[PDB]
Each structure stands twice: as C-alpha cells, then as structure tokens.
C-alpha cells in the first residue's frame, strides 16, 4: 500500500519531475518495474503532465474509462478524485514522494 | 522544466570552470556535461559524471571565449535509458 498517492516503481520521466512543481490536480500512481501489476496515473494539468494507463481485467478489476471499473486501486483513485471521467481533471493533490 | 533544475559556475580561472547543479529527488543514472564555443562550428566536447555528484570541473578552455555548457541527466528504468530536458548556460572566461 503506502497511500500518499502511490509512488510505486517510478518511471514516466521521474513522475513528470515529481509533478514539475505541482498544480492542477497534482497526481501520483506509478507502476512498471519488472511488471508491478501494470500501472499508470500521472496527472498535472495546466503545466503539463497527462499519463493514463490503468487497464485491467482477468478477474482483477481496474479502470481508466471502460464505463467505470473498480475492484481496488484506492476505489479507482477516490472515484476519479471526484469526477474526471476520462481524465483531464479530477485527481486532487498526491505528490510528495521524495519532493 | 529541465533536469538538473539549476546550473551555475561556482569558480572560474581563465582556462577552467567549476560548475554545480541541483540534483533532483529522483535517481539519476548518470550525467553528461557537454561544452563548446558558442560560436557554433567549434567541436563540442563532452564527458560523463556519476548520478551521485552535482559538480564538475571543465578545463582546457580558451581564455576570454564564450562557451555553452550543457548538463544532461539520464533516467534508467524498465531496461530503457532516456534523457530529461537538459540545462545549459553561457559563460565567458
Ligand atoms: Cl487515500
């Protein structure tokens, strides 16, 4: 677990430079490594970022669109961070993580 | 929007320079310091530095000539090496 926005593995350009100073919806997530169960997130907003990934199936739930989803992943990131259907908003802070 | 985020000449002689930068919170695989005359056509030199250092000495410069010093930082992850946006400065010895 951890919490605190995840922070698992790393990559994705060092998490966009640890969020690039922060703003918008912040972000977090992670994954990769030698597998890590898949992964994703990102975030940002005005100042860049993006990301995505997610996915899932095979009994394991998941999400990132697909008409909702679920089964873990912090309740799909707290329901998108409270909306944010296809990304493009939502989230709601995260960051830290060495910052 | 670069890694490292700061870059400075800390000390200077007519032929050498001491440069420092702010290391990032993430793991740098290794740095590449490049430098060449701002004129353009004059051969750009470069060398590498462990991802654990945040300083480097450049020597053998033409005194009085304006060079461009660039520092790149590498990310290594999932069997792939990749480069952050670099940082660069102009300095006149
Ligand atoms: Cl939470």
Numbering used by the authors:
A (entry chain A): 142 to 240
B (entry chain H): 6 to 98
Quote the study on this structure.
Among the most commonly used non-immunoglobulin binders are monobodies (Mb), which are generated from large combinatorial libraries using a fibronectin III domain (FN3; ~10 kDa) of human fibronectin as molecular scaffold. Here, we develop monobodies with nanomolar binding affinities against the d-SH2 domain of the leukemic tyrosine kinase BCR::ABL1. Two crystal structures of heterochiral monobody-SH2 complexes reveal targeting of the pY binding pocket by an unconventional binding mode. In summary, monobody recognition is dominated by the FG loop of both monobodies that form a rippled β-sheet with the βD-strand of the SH2 domain, as well as ionic interactions between glutamate residues of the monobody and arginine residues of the SH2 domain.
We determined the crystal structures of the l-DAM21-d-Abl SH2 and l-DAM27-d-Abl SH2 complexes at 2.7 Å and 2.9 Å resolution, respectively. In both structures, we found the d-SH2 domain to be dimerized via a disulfide bridge of Cys198. Unlike those, DAM21/27 form a heterochiral anti-parallel β-sheet between strand Gly84 to Trp88/His88 in DAM21/27 of their FG loop with the βD-strand (Val190 to Arg194) of the d-Abl SH2 domain. The rippled β-sheet position Glu85 in the FG loop is inserted into the SH2 pY pocket, where it forms an ionic interaction with SH2 residue Arg171, which is part of the conserved FLVRES motif and makes the most critical interaction with the phosphate group in pY peptide ligands. In DAM21, FG loop residue Asp83 forms an additional ionic interaction with Arg194, unique in the Abl1 SH2 domain and therefore a possible contributor to selective Abl1 binding. To probe the functional roles of Asp83 and Glu85, we produced a D83A/E85A mutant in DAM21. ITC measurements showed no detectable binding, thus validating the critical role of these residues for SH2 domain binding and interface 2 as the biologically relevant protein interaction site. In DAM27, Tyr79 packs towards the β-hairpin and His88 is solvent exposed, whereas in DAM21, Trp88 is rotated inwards and would clash with large hydrophobic or aromatic residues at this position. Hence, Tyr79 is exchanged to Ser79 in DAM21. As observed in the DAM21 crystal structure, the monobody CD loop is not involved in Abl SH2 binding.
